[PDB]
Coordinates of C-alpha atoms and ligand atoms in Angstrom, one line a residue:
Chain O
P1 CA 0.1 0.0 0.1
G2 CA 2.7 2.5 -1.2
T3 CA 1.6 5.8 0.7
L4 CA 2.1 7.3 3.9
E5 CA -1.5 7.3 4.4
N6 CA -1.3 5.2 7.5
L7 CA 0.6 8.0 9.2
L8 CA -2.4 10.6 8.9
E9 CA -4.6 8.0 9.8
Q10 CA -3.1 6.8 13.0
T11 CA -4.2 9.8 15.3
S12 CA -2.7 8.2 18.3
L13 CA 0.8 9.0 17.1
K14 CA 2.6 11.8 19.0
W15 CA 6.1 11.7 17.6
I16 CA 7.5 10.8 14.3
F17 CA 10.9 10.6 13.6
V18 CA 12.2 10.9 10.0
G19 CA 16.0 9.7 9.1
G20 CA 18.2 8.4 6.4
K21 CA 21.9 8.8 5.7
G22 CA 22.0 12.1 4.0
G23 CA 21.8 12.9 0.4
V24 CA 18.5 11.6 -0.1
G25 CA 16.0 14.5 -0.1
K26 CA 15.5 13.5 3.7
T27 CA 14.7 17.3 4.6
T28 CA 12.0 17.6 1.8
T29 CA 10.2 14.4 3.1
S30 CA 10.2 15.7 6.9
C31 CA 8.6 18.9 5.5
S32 CA 6.2 17.2 3.0
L33 CA 5.2 14.9 6.0
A34 CA 4.6 17.8 8.3
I35 CA 2.4 19.9 5.8
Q36 CA 0.3 16.7 5.1
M37 CA 0.1 16.3 8.9
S38 CA -1.0 19.7 9.7
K39 CA -3.8 19.3 7.4
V40 CA -5.6 16.6 9.9
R41 CA -4.1 17.6 13.1
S42 CA -4.6 20.4 15.3
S43 CA -1.3 21.4 16.3
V44 CA 2.1 20.1 14.3
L45 CA 5.6 20.8 15.3
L46 CA 8.7 20.1 12.7
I47 CA 12.1 20.2 14.6
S48 CA 15.3 19.5 13.1
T49 CA 18.8 18.8 14.5
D50 CA 20.7 19.0 11.2
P51 CA 22.9 21.9 12.0
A52 CA 23.0 22.8 8.2
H53 CA 19.7 24.7 8.9
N54 CA 18.4 22.7 6.1
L55 CA 14.8 23.5 7.3
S56 CA 15.3 27.3 6.9
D57 CA 16.6 26.8 3.4
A58 CA 13.8 24.9 2.4
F59 CA 10.9 27.1 3.5
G60 CA 12.8 30.6 2.8
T61 CA 12.1 31.6 6.5
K62 CA 14.7 31.5 9.3
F63 CA 14.3 29.5 12.1
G64 CA 15.9 29.0 15.3
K65 CA 16.3 27.6 18.9
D66 CA 12.6 28.5 19.6
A67 CA 9.2 27.6 17.8
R68 CA 8.1 29.9 15.2
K69 CA 4.6 29.5 13.2
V70 CA 5.6 28.5 9.8
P71 CA 4.5 31.4 7.3
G72 CA 1.8 30.0 5.1
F73 CA 0.0 27.7 7.6
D74 CA -2.1 27.7 10.6
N75 CA -1.1 25.3 13.1
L76 CA 2.2 24.1 11.8
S77 CA 5.4 25.5 13.8
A78 CA 9.0 24.9 13.1
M79 CA 12.2 24.9 15.3
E80 CA 15.8 24.4 14.5
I81 CA 18.1 23.2 17.0
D82 CA 21.8 22.3 17.2
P83 CA 22.9 20.2 20.0
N84 CA 26.4 21.2 20.3
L85 CA 24.9 24.7 21.2
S86 CA 22.5 23.3 23.7
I87 CA 25.3 21.9 25.2
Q88 CA 27.8 24.7 26.0
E89 CA 24.3 26.9 26.7
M90 CA 23.5 24.3 29.4
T91 CA 26.8 23.9 31.0
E92 CA 28.1 27.3 31.5
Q93 CA 24.6 28.1 32.9
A94 CA 25.6 25.9 35.8
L95 CA 28.2 21.2 37.6
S96 CA 30.0 19.8 34.5
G97 CA 33.5 19.1 36.1
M98 CA 32.1 16.2 37.6
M99 CA 29.9 15.5 34.3
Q100 CA 33.3 15.4 32.5
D101 CA 34.7 12.7 34.8
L102 CA 31.5 11.2 33.8
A103 CA 32.1 12.3 30.3
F104 CA 34.9 9.9 29.2
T105 CA 33.3 6.9 31.0
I106 CA 30.3 7.5 29.5
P107 CA 30.6 8.8 26.0
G108 CA 28.0 11.4 24.9
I109 CA 26.2 12.2 28.2
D110 CA 26.2 15.7 27.2
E111 CA 24.6 15.2 23.8
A112 CA 22.1 13.1 25.6
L113 CA 21.5 15.5 28.6
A114 CA 20.8 17.9 25.9
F115 CA 18.4 15.7 24.2
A116 CA 16.5 15.3 27.7
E117 CA 15.9 18.9 28.0
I118 CA 14.8 19.5 24.3
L119 CA 12.3 16.7 25.0
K120 CA 10.9 18.4 28.2
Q121 CA 10.5 21.5 26.3
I122 CA 8.7 20.0 23.5
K123 CA 6.4 18.3 25.8
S124 CA 5.5 21.4 27.5
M125 CA 4.4 23.1 24.4
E126 CA 2.0 20.4 24.1
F127 CA 1.9 20.0 20.2
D128 CA -0.8 17.2 19.1
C129 CA 1.9 15.7 17.0
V130 CA 5.6 16.5 16.4
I131 CA 8.1 15.3 13.5
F132 CA 11.6 15.1 14.2
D133 CA 14.2 15.6 11.4
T134 CA 17.3 13.6 12.4
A135 CA 20.8 14.5 11.3
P136 CA 22.2 13.3 7.9
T137 CA 25.4 11.9 9.1
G138 CA 27.0 9.9 12.1
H139 CA 24.7 8.4 14.4
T140 CA 21.0 9.2 13.1
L141 CA 19.6 7.8 16.0
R142 CA 21.1 9.4 19.0
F143 CA 17.9 10.9 20.0
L144 CA 16.1 7.6 20.5
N145 CA 19.1 6.3 22.4
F146 CA 19.2 9.4 24.9
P147 CA 17.4 7.5 27.8
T148 CA 19.9 4.5 27.3
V149 CA 22.9 6.9 27.8
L150 CA 21.2 8.5 30.9
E151 CA 20.5 5.3 32.4
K152 CA 24.2 4.0 32.2
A153 CA 25.2 7.3 34.0
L154 CA 22.6 6.7 36.7
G155 CA 24.0 3.3 37.3
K156 CA 27.5 4.8 37.6
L157 CA 26.1 7.3 40.0
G158 CA 24.2 5.2 42.3
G159 CA 27.2 3.6 43.7
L160 CA 28.6 7.0 44.6
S161 CA 28.5 8.4 47.9
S162 CA 26.9 11.9 49.0
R163 CA 29.3 14.9 47.8
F164 CA 28.0 14.4 44.4
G165 CA 24.6 15.8 45.7
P166 CA 25.4 18.7 43.4
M167 CA 25.6 17.1 40.2
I168 CA 22.8 14.6 41.0
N169 CA 20.5 17.4 41.8
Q170 CA 21.8 19.3 38.7
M171 CA 21.0 16.6 36.4
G172 CA 17.7 16.3 38.0
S173 CA 16.5 19.7 37.1
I174 CA 17.4 19.7 33.5
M175 CA 15.2 16.9 33.1
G176 CA 12.2 17.7 35.5
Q177 CA 13.1 17.4 46.5
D178 CA 16.6 16.0 47.5
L179 CA 17.3 12.5 49.1
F180 CA 18.3 9.3 47.3
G181 CA 14.7 9.1 45.8
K182 CA 15.4 12.0 43.5
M183 CA 18.1 9.9 42.1
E184 CA 15.3 7.1 41.6
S185 CA 12.8 9.6 40.2
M186 CA 14.8 10.2 37.4
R187 CA 15.0 6.6 36.8
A188 CA 11.2 7.0 36.7
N189 CA 11.3 9.9 34.2
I190 CA 13.8 7.9 31.9
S191 CA 11.6 4.9 32.0
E192 CA 8.7 7.2 30.7
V193 CA 10.4 8.3 27.7
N194 CA 11.5 4.5 27.0
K195 CA 7.7 3.6 27.3
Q196 CA 6.5 6.3 24.8
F197 CA 9.4 5.7 22.2
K198 CA 8.9 2.1 22.3
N199 CA 5.1 2.3 22.2
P200 CA 3.9 1.7 18.4
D201 CA 0.5 3.6 19.4
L202 CA 2.6 6.7 20.2
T203 CA 5.9 6.7 18.3
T204 CA 7.0 5.4 14.8
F205 CA 10.0 6.1 12.7
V206 CA 10.0 6.5 8.8
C207 CA 13.2 5.7 7.0
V208 CA 14.0 7.4 3.9
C209 CA 16.7 6.4 1.0
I210 CA 17.4 6.4 -2.8
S211 CA 17.6 3.4 -5.0
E212 CA 21.3 2.6 -5.0
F213 CA 23.5 0.2 -3.7
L214 CA 25.1 2.2 -0.8
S215 CA 21.7 3.9 0.4
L216 CA 20.3 0.3 0.7
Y217 CA 23.3 -0.9 2.6
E218 CA 23.3 2.0 5.0
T219 CA 19.4 1.9 5.3
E220 CA 19.4 -1.7 6.5
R221 CA 22.0 -1.3 9.1
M222 CA 19.5 1.4 10.1
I223 CA 16.4 -0.5 10.5
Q224 CA 18.5 -3.6 12.1
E225 CA 19.7 -0.7 14.7
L226 CA 16.2 0.5 15.0
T227 CA 14.4 -3.1 16.0
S228 CA 17.3 -3.3 18.4
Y229 CA 16.4 0.0 20.1
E230 CA 12.8 -1.3 20.0
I231 CA 11.4 1.3 17.7
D232 CA 8.5 0.6 15.6
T233 CA 9.1 1.3 12.0
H234 CA 6.8 0.5 8.8
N235 CA 7.3 3.3 6.2
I236 CA 10.2 3.8 3.9
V237 CA 10.1 6.5 1.1
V238 CA 12.6 6.3 -2.0
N239 CA 13.3 9.5 -3.5
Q240 CA 14.8 10.9 -6.5
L241 CA 14.0 7.8 -8.6
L242 CA 13.1 8.7 -12.2
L243 CA 10.1 6.6 -13.6
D244 CA 9.2 7.6 -16.9
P245 CA 8.9 3.8 -18.3
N246 CA 9.7 5.0 -21.8
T247 CA 12.7 7.1 -21.7
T248 CA 15.0 8.4 -24.6
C249 CA 17.9 9.7 -22.9
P250 CA 20.6 7.0 -23.0
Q251 CA 22.1 8.0 -19.4
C252 CA 18.5 8.4 -17.7
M253 CA 18.1 4.7 -19.2
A254 CA 21.0 3.3 -17.6
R255 CA 20.4 5.2 -14.5
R256 CA 16.6 3.9 -14.5
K257 CA 18.0 0.3 -15.0
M258 CA 20.0 0.4 -11.8
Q259 CA 17.5 2.1 -10.0
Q260 CA 14.8 -0.4 -11.0
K261 CA 16.7 -3.6 -9.8
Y262 CA 17.5 -2.0 -6.5
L263 CA 14.0 -0.9 -6.1
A264 CA 13.2 -4.6 -6.9
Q265 CA 15.0 -5.8 -4.1
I266 CA 13.6 -3.1 -1.6
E267 CA 9.9 -4.1 -2.5
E268 CA 10.9 -7.8 -1.7
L269 CA 12.7 -7.2 1.8
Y270 CA 10.1 -5.1 3.1
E271 CA 6.7 -6.7 2.5
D272 CA 5.8 -5.4 5.9
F273 CA 6.7 -1.5 5.1
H274 CA 4.7 0.8 3.1
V275 CA 7.1 1.5 0.4
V276 CA 6.2 4.8 -1.2
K277 CA 8.1 5.8 -4.4
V278 CA 8.5 9.5 -5.4
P279 CA 10.1 10.9 -8.5
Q280 CA 13.3 13.3 -9.0
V281 CA 12.3 16.6 -9.5
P282 CA 14.4 18.8 -12.0
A283 CA 14.3 22.0 -9.9
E284 CA 15.1 22.1 -6.3
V285 CA 12.3 22.0 -4.1
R286 CA 12.0 25.4 -2.5
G287 CA 9.2 27.7 -1.0
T288 CA 5.9 27.0 0.6
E289 CA 4.1 26.3 -2.5
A290 CA 6.5 24.1 -4.2
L291 CA 6.4 21.8 -1.0
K292 CA 2.8 21.9 -0.7
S293 CA 2.8 20.4 -4.2
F294 CA 5.3 18.0 -3.6
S295 CA 3.8 16.5 -0.3
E296 CA 1.2 15.3 -2.7
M297 CA 3.2 12.5 -4.1
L298 CA 3.5 11.4 -0.2
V299 CA -0.3 10.5 0.0
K300 CA -1.1 9.8 -3.5
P301 CA 1.1 7.3 -5.5
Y302 CA 2.7 9.1 -8.6
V303 CA 2.6 7.9 -12.1
Chain F
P1 CA 47.4 17.0 -11.8
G2 CA 44.2 15.0 -12.3
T3 CA 45.6 11.6 -13.8
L4 CA 47.0 8.2 -12.2
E5 CA 50.1 8.8 -13.8
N6 CA 52.0 9.3 -10.6
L7 CA 51.5 5.4 -9.9
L8 CA 53.1 4.0 -13.2
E9 CA 55.9 6.5 -12.6
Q10 CA 56.6 5.4 -9.1
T11 CA 58.3 2.2 -9.8
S12 CA 59.2 1.5 -6.3
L13 CA 55.6 0.7 -5.5
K14 CA 55.0 -3.0 -4.6
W15 CA 51.5 -2.8 -3.3
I16 CA 48.7 -0.7 -4.6
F17 CA 45.2 -1.2 -2.7
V18 CA 42.1 0.3 -4.2
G19 CA 38.9 0.5 -2.4
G20 CA 35.8 2.3 -2.0
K21 CA 32.5 1.7 -0.3
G22 CA 30.5 -0.2 -3.1
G23 CA 28.5 0.7 -6.0
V24 CA 31.0 3.3 -7.3
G25 CA 32.8 1.3 -10.0
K26 CA 35.5 0.1 -7.9
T27 CA 36.0 -3.2 -9.8
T28 CA 36.4 -1.3 -13.1
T29 CA 38.8 1.0 -11.9
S30 CA 41.2 -1.6 -10.4
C31 CA 41.2 -3.6 -13.7
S32 CA 41.8 -0.4 -15.6
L33 CA 44.8 0.4 -13.4
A34 CA 46.2 -3.2 -13.5
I35 CA 45.9 -3.4 -17.4
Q36 CA 47.9 0.3 -17.4
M37 CA 50.3 -1.0 -14.8
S38 CA 51.1 -4.2 -16.9
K39 CA 52.3 -2.0 -19.8
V40 CA 54.9 -0.5 -17.9
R41 CA 56.1 -3.4 -15.4
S42 CA 57.3 -6.9 -15.6
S43 CA 55.0 -8.9 -13.7
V44 CA 51.6 -7.5 -12.3
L45 CA 48.8 -9.4 -10.3
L46 CA 45.3 -8.4 -9.6
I47 CA 43.8 -9.8 -6.5
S48 CA 40.2 -9.3 -5.4
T49 CA 38.7 -10.4 -2.1
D50 CA 35.1 -9.3 -3.4
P51 CA 33.2 -12.5 -2.8
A52 CA 30.8 -11.7 -5.7
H53 CA 33.5 -13.0 -8.3
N54 CA 33.3 -9.4 -9.8
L55 CA 36.8 -10.1 -11.4
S56 CA 35.6 -12.9 -13.4
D57 CA 32.2 -11.1 -14.2
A58 CA 34.4 -8.1 -15.7
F59 CA 36.9 -10.1 -17.9
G60 CA 34.6 -12.9 -18.9
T61 CA 36.9 -15.5 -17.7
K62 CA 36.7 -17.5 -14.4
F63 CA 39.2 -16.8 -11.9
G64 CA 39.8 -18.6 -8.4
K65 CA 41.8 -19.2 -5.4
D66 CA 45.2 -19.3 -7.6
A67 CA 46.8 -17.3 -10.1
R68 CA 45.9 -17.5 -13.7
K69 CA 47.2 -15.5 -16.5
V70 CA 44.7 -13.2 -17.9
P71 CA 43.3 -13.7 -21.4
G72 CA 44.7 -10.8 -23.6
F73 CA 47.9 -9.8 -21.8
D74 CA 51.5 -11.2 -21.4
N75 CA 52.3 -10.2 -17.9
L76 CA 49.2 -9.7 -16.0
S77 CA 47.7 -12.5 -14.0
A78 CA 44.6 -12.5 -11.6
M79 CA 43.0 -14.3 -8.6
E80 CA 39.9 -14.1 -6.7
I81 CA 40.0 -15.2 -2.9
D82 CA 37.4 -15.5 -0.5
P83 CA 38.5 -15.2 3.2
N84 CA 35.6 -17.0 4.7
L85 CA 36.6 -20.1 2.5
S86 CA 40.5 -19.6 3.1
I87 CA 39.5 -19.8 6.8
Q88 CA 37.4 -23.0 7.1
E89 CA 40.2 -24.6 4.7
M90 CA 43.2 -23.6 7.0
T91 CA 41.4 -24.4 10.4
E92 CA 40.3 -28.2 9.5
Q93 CA 43.7 -28.2 7.7
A94 CA 45.0 -28.3 11.2
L95 CA 44.5 -26.0 16.6
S96 CA 41.7 -23.9 16.3
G97 CA 40.0 -24.7 19.6
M98 CA 42.5 -22.6 21.2
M99 CA 42.2 -20.1 18.3
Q100 CA 38.5 -19.9 19.3
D101 CA 39.1 -18.9 22.9
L102 CA 41.3 -16.4 21.3
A103 CA 38.6 -15.8 18.6
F104 CA 36.3 -14.1 21.2
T105 CA 38.6 -12.1 23.1
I106 CA 40.1 -10.9 19.5
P107 CA 37.6 -10.4 17.2
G108 CA 38.5 -11.5 13.7
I109 CA 42.2 -13.4 14.1
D110 CA 40.7 -16.0 11.7
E111 CA 40.0 -13.4 9.1
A112 CA 43.4 -12.1 9.9
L113 CA 45.5 -15.3 9.9
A114 CA 43.8 -15.6 6.5
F115 CA 45.2 -12.8 5.1
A116 CA 48.4 -13.3 6.6
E117 CA 49.0 -16.8 4.5
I118 CA 47.4 -15.1 1.6
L119 CA 50.2 -12.5 1.7
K120 CA 53.0 -15.2 2.2
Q121 CA 51.6 -16.5 -1.1
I122 CA 51.8 -13.4 -3.2
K123 CA 55.0 -12.8 -1.8
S124 CA 56.5 -16.0 -2.8
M125 CA 55.2 -15.7 -6.4
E126 CA 57.2 -12.6 -6.7
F127 CA 55.2 -10.0 -8.9
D128 CA 56.7 -6.9 -9.6
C129 CA 53.7 -4.9 -8.6
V130 CA 50.3 -6.4 -7.1
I131 CA 46.9 -4.4 -7.1
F132 CA 44.6 -5.5 -4.4
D133 CA 41.0 -4.8 -4.9
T134 CA 39.3 -4.7 -1.5
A135 CA 35.7 -5.8 -0.6
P136 CA 32.8 -3.2 -1.3
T137 CA 31.1 -3.3 2.0
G138 CA 32.0 -3.7 5.9
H139 CA 35.5 -3.0 6.9
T140 CA 37.2 -2.3 3.7
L141 CA 40.3 -2.2 5.5
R142 CA 40.6 -5.3 7.1
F143 CA 43.7 -6.5 5.0
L144 CA 45.8 -3.6 6.1
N145 CA 45.0 -4.3 9.6
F146 CA 45.8 -7.7 9.9
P147 CA 49.2 -7.1 11.6
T148 CA 47.5 -5.1 14.2
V149 CA 45.0 -8.0 14.8
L150 CA 47.9 -10.6 15.0
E151 CA 50.0 -8.3 17.4
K152 CA 47.2 -8.1 19.8
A153 CA 46.9 -12.0 19.8
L154 CA 50.6 -12.3 20.3
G155 CA 50.1 -10.1 23.3
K156 CA 47.6 -12.3 25.1
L157 CA 49.9 -15.4 24.0
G158 CA 53.0 -14.0 25.7
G159 CA 51.5 -14.3 28.9
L160 CA 50.5 -17.7 28.4
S161 CA 52.5 -20.7 29.9
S162 CA 53.6 -23.9 27.8
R163 CA 51.0 -26.3 26.8
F164 CA 49.9 -23.8 24.2
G165 CA 53.1 -24.8 22.1
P166 CA 50.7 -26.7 19.8
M167 CA 48.8 -23.5 18.9
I168 CA 51.9 -21.0 18.9
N169 CA 53.6 -23.4 16.7
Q170 CA 50.6 -23.9 14.5
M171 CA 50.3 -19.9 14.1
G172 CA 53.9 -19.8 13.3
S173 CA 53.9 -21.8 10.3
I174 CA 51.0 -20.5 8.3
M175 CA 52.8 -17.0 8.7
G176 CA 56.5 -18.4 8.0
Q177 CA 62.4 -24.0 15.4
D178 CA 60.3 -23.9 18.7
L179 CA 61.7 -22.0 21.8
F180 CA 60.1 -18.8 23.2
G181 CA 62.1 -17.1 20.2
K182 CA 59.8 -18.5 17.7
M183 CA 56.9 -16.5 19.5
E184 CA 59.3 -13.5 19.2
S185 CA 60.1 -14.2 15.6
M186 CA 56.5 -13.9 14.5
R187 CA 56.5 -10.6 16.0
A188 CA 59.4 -9.6 13.4
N189 CA 57.5 -10.9 10.7
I190 CA 54.5 -8.9 11.6
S191 CA 56.7 -5.8 12.1
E192 CA 58.0 -6.6 8.5
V193 CA 54.9 -6.5 7.0
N194 CA 53.6 -3.2 9.1
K195 CA 57.2 -1.4 7.9
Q196 CA 56.1 -2.1 4.2
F197 CA 52.6 -1.1 4.5
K198 CA 53.6 2.1 6.1
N199 CA 56.2 3.0 3.6
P200 CA 55.1 5.4 1.0
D201 CA 57.8 4.1 -1.4
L202 CA 56.4 0.7 -1.3
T203 CA 52.7 0.9 -0.7
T204 CA 50.0 3.5 -1.4
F205 CA 46.3 3.5 -1.4
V206 CA 43.6 4.7 -4.2
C207 CA 40.0 5.7 -3.2
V208 CA 37.5 5.6 -5.4
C209 CA 33.9 7.2 -5.0
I210 CA 31.0 8.8 -7.0
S211 CA 30.0 12.6 -6.6
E212 CA 27.0 12.3 -4.3
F213 CA 26.8 13.1 -0.5
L214 CA 26.7 9.9 0.9
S215 CA 29.5 8.5 -1.2
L216 CA 31.7 11.5 -0.1
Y217 CA 30.8 11.1 3.6
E218 CA 31.9 7.2 3.6
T219 CA 34.9 8.3 1.8
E220 CA 36.1 10.8 4.1
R221 CA 35.6 8.2 7.2
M222 CA 37.8 6.1 4.9
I223 CA 40.6 8.3 4.4
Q224 CA 40.8 9.2 8.1
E225 CA 40.9 5.7 8.9
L226 CA 43.6 5.6 6.5
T227 CA 45.9 8.1 8.1
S228 CA 45.2 6.3 11.3
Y229 CA 46.3 3.0 10.0
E230 CA 49.3 5.4 8.8
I231 CA 48.9 3.9 4.9
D232 CA 49.9 6.4 2.6
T233 CA 46.9 8.0 0.1
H234 CA 47.4 10.3 -2.8
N235 CA 44.6 9.3 -5.3
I236 CA 41.2 9.4 -5.7
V237 CA 38.8 8.6 -8.9
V238 CA 35.4 9.8 -9.1
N239 CA 33.4 7.7 -11.5
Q240 CA 30.0 7.6 -13.3
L241 CA 29.8 11.4 -13.2
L242 CA 28.4 12.8 -16.4
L243 CA 30.2 15.9 -17.9
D244 CA 28.9 17.1 -21.1
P245 CA 28.5 21.0 -20.4
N246 CA 25.5 21.7 -22.5
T247 CA 23.3 18.6 -22.2
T248 CA 19.5 19.0 -23.0
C249 CA 18.1 16.0 -21.0
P250 CA 16.3 17.9 -18.0
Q251 CA 16.9 15.0 -15.6
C252 CA 20.5 14.6 -16.6
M253 CA 21.0 18.5 -15.9
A254 CA 19.7 17.9 -12.7
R255 CA 21.9 15.2 -11.8
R256 CA 25.1 17.1 -13.3
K257 CA 24.2 20.0 -10.9
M258 CA 24.3 18.0 -8.0
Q259 CA 27.3 16.4 -9.2
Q260 CA 29.2 19.4 -10.1
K261 CA 28.7 20.8 -6.6
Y262 CA 29.9 17.7 -4.7
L263 CA 33.0 17.5 -7.2
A264 CA 33.6 21.1 -6.3
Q265 CA 33.7 19.9 -2.7
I266 CA 36.0 17.3 -3.5
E267 CA 38.5 19.4 -5.4
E268 CA 38.8 21.8 -2.8
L269 CA 39.2 19.2 0.4
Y270 CA 42.1 17.2 -1.5
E271 CA 44.4 19.7 -2.9
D272 CA 46.8 17.0 -1.8
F273 CA 45.5 14.1 -3.9
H274 CA 45.6 13.6 -7.6
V275 CA 41.5 13.8 -8.3
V276 CA 40.7 12.0 -11.4
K277 CA 37.6 12.6 -13.2
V278 CA 35.9 9.8 -15.4
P279 CA 32.8 9.6 -17.0
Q280 CA 29.5 7.6 -17.0
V281 CA 29.6 4.9 -19.5
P282 CA 26.1 3.9 -21.0
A283 CA 27.1 0.3 -21.7
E284 CA 28.5 -1.8 -18.9
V285 CA 32.2 -2.2 -19.0
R286 CA 32.6 -5.8 -20.0
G287 CA 35.2 -7.6 -22.0
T288 CA 39.2 -7.2 -22.3
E289 CA 38.8 -4.8 -25.3
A290 CA 36.1 -2.5 -23.7
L291 CA 38.4 -2.5 -20.6
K292 CA 41.6 -1.5 -22.4
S293 CA 39.8 1.6 -24.0
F294 CA 38.4 2.5 -20.7
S295 CA 41.7 2.4 -18.8
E296 CA 42.3 5.2 -21.1
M297 CA 40.7 7.8 -19.0
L298 CA 42.7 6.9 -15.9
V299 CA 46.0 8.2 -17.7
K300 CA 44.7 10.9 -19.9
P301 CA 42.1 13.5 -18.5
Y302 CA 38.7 13.1 -20.4
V303 CA 36.9 16.1 -22.5
Ligands
LIG401 ZN1 19.1 12.0 -18.8

C-alpha cells in the first residue's frame, strides 16, 4: 500500500521520526510529511537537529532554537536546534566538571542531557503531533538512544556516595526534592520516555533513502539498529528515482535500469513496510508552494 | 594533476590497494589500473577479495583461488579469493579450539590469519607489482589491519605458559624452530609487513567514489581511518559522473548540477590528492577490449 496515508490515519501518534543517511531528500520528506499532517491535526511541530539549517533553506524563512509558526500555515510551527550549542549553553549555565569525569566513562552524556531537555521543552508546548528531522550523518539515532545513555550514567552514580549531591541535583533539574529518591525519580522519568518511544501507538519512525547500493546498505543497518532500539518502523520512502517507463536519454535509461533492480530488492525485503515511491524533481524544492505541491506524492502514488 | 600517471611512474611501488564503499565502479577501476600497470612493469597481479566474483564477471573468464594469466595480456595474472573459505580451509587443515578461545577475546583473528597466509603466498610468487581490489562493504580495510590484529593476539599469548606450544607453533607455520624465540620471531614477521605497508615508497592506496553526498561521507571516514592506519594515500578517482557541459535532458541536467557541487567540494578538500574524473559509460564495461579502452581515462584526462 505504497503511501504514507497510514500515518495521517493513526491519530494516536505523538512522535514521528524521519531519518536516512543524508543525500536522499530527507529534509524535503520531513517537511512534506509535516505539511500533510498539519491538514489533519490540531497542532503540528517540525524540529530539526541538522546543523546545516536545512529547514530554513527549504521554507525560505529563518528558524531558530525556538518555535516559530511557519509562514503559510495555521497550525504548523518549526524549530531548528543544534545540540553542540545547547550543550555549551546548558553547562556554563551551571556542575560539568563532575559530568566530564562522567563524560569519558560515558561517551555522549552531554549530547544526551541536551536531548533530555530539548524533549521536556517540546512536551511542555503540547503539540498534538511532532515530526523529528534527524541529522544526515554519524549516528542518525542519537536522539532515540538518549534514555539509554542517561540510564548508564545513573548506574554509575548510584554507587557514588554523597558529595555528588550537587551534580545529581543538577542533572535532576534539566530533566524535571533531594534524598536518594530524586536519584530514583529520574529513573522513573527515563523509564517514561522509553515507554513512549517503544510504544507503536505513540511513536514510529520513517526511513528515507534512494535506490542505490550504498543507500540500501546504510538503510538496512539503520533498520536493524532500530528493531534493536525497539522503535517501531513501517514506512520507507525512496526519492529521486526516475520513473518514465519509456525514456529516450541513454544515460537516464542506464540510471533507471540500476534503480529499478534495487527498487526490486527493496520491494521484496520489506513486504511489511509501506514503500512509497517518489520521482526526481528537476528543480530544487523550495518555497511554501513548491513544498505543498510536492507533499502530494507522499499521500497519492505518482504515475 | 588529475590523472593516475604518478602510479605508473613510481616504480618502487610493490602494493597498490584500491577501495571504495561499493557501487562506485570500484572493480572497473581496479582492472583499468592493473592493465595500465602491466604496460610498464614486468609482472603484475590483480587480486580481489570481493566474494561476488566481480573480477570474473568483468573479464569474461573465470578466476579462482590461484593465479591464472589473464586472457589478452602477457604479464598480467589474476586471482579471486574469498577469506571465509580460506578460513575453514586452513582450520580443518590442522589447533583452532584454542584459536576460538582466542576468537572471542580477539575479534577476527581468523580473518587476519587468513590474510597473513594469502600475503605469504603473493610474496612467494614474486610479482613486480600487485593491485588489491578490496571488498565493497563492511570494513574495506581489514587487510591492511591484519598485522594489528595478529600483534594483539601475540600479546595475549606471551603471558600464557607452555601447553599452548601446539597453537603458537601452529600459528607460526601459516605465517612463516620452537622455543620462546619463535614466539618473538613472528613479532618480527609482523613488524616486517607493517613497515612495508606504512612505507610510501612501497605501498599506497587509491580511493574511488562517486560524486554524491553519501559517497563523499563514507569516503572521508575511510581516508581518516587510513591516515590512522598510517597507510599513504594520494589518489582518488570519481566515477559515473556525467560531464557534457551543454546537455539537454532535464534529468541529466539536475544530476549534473548536484554532481558538480560535490565535485567542487572534493576538489577543495583534497588539494594534496590527484583527483581524476571519469565519465558515466552507457554500456556496462565488459570484455578485455572494452576494459583496455576504458583504462585510457585513468591516464589521460577526459573531455
Ligand atoms: Zn538524462
